[PDB]
Amino acid sequence: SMVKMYGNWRSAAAFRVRIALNLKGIAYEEVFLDLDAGDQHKPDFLAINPQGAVPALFDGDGPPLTQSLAILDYLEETRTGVPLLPEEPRARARARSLAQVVACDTHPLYVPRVRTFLMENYGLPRERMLEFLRNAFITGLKTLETRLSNEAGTGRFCQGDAVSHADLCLISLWVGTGIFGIDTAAYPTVKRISEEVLALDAVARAHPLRQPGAPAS
């Protein structure tokens, strides 16, 4: 009778879903887990989510929905009022391709499990592990800047003049440049669009720094 999300303040995947829920006007409650303190591995949570996935979304009766892109499409197909994809198939594919530059090629390389594995498996200090994270960000940001700057499809937003899944993924990476201290001077098109997206109430309300567990700044 109300959507329930299990999330985390910092998670880019949780942020994407949170934005979509807000943009579409879907009432929900979010439960915040500490992913650094191993809440995702606790048996009581595992009782409702065996593989421990965050974010996890419960939409009334049914098993939970996981994986941020799959969830975004689920919301698109079940709540159609404010569409977050265009209608034309090539435009949809481009928007999804841009989203996946982030959600497939970039973000999975900097999740907490990877950060901890690099340190624990190789004995790398945090300072050296972060070289992997920074490289992921920079590689992704370079691709997005080139594509957004040179391709005809870009408008006010990543694809045309309507917010799409591409923008939700883009802003989720952009906020990470703040959280993880990546220089963004070289990506002015990414900046312009990210600020355009961040100016929206639905996006700002969902910002990691406005969630429980966040640091001050």
Place this chain on the structure above:
Amino acid sequence: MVKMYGNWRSAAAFRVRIALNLKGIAYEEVFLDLDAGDQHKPDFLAINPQGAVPALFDGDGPPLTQSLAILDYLEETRTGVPLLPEEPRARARARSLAQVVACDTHPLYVPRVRTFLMENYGLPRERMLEFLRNAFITGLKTLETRLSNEAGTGRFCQGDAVSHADLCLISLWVGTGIFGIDTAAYPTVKRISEEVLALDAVARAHPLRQPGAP
């Protein structure tokens, strides 16, 4: 006609190749040699700034990249057997399973990452491969748990019809052979993978049956 810049070993190219065959879409594949640095030539960076495969040209217009986006494009613009169910919960489940591979697992073992680990940290190949192995095992454990215990699984990942979930699953499964990952602990994954492999459209698209393979 459809034209794909591909590679024999690429899991992402394999996903797309399977869909083309299943849906009765003819294609030309250009096989890049990624050991030889074909992905890094200007011509190709022009096509894909990411320096990666696959890239798909569908007539005129710009190339399409990202295997999941391409799979949905093929679903939406072509006829041929559906590779997603009709009901949104089922579609979301299929996509989620696909994304365990395509988001959480596969991006950790692509060539650019293997090369970065060796070059940036000076890791020997054998030590770099621990990162690759950990990715496979992590994804395989997640898939085994989900597929074995969730009600949605049938003959295939989602119900009894092949979907995007299976194309991604088998793209991981074939890598267990190529990269030498033990699979004894994932019997449900094995069952479904061999079910999918039995389909001639999938068997034709197998990495080891592509030009450039050993």
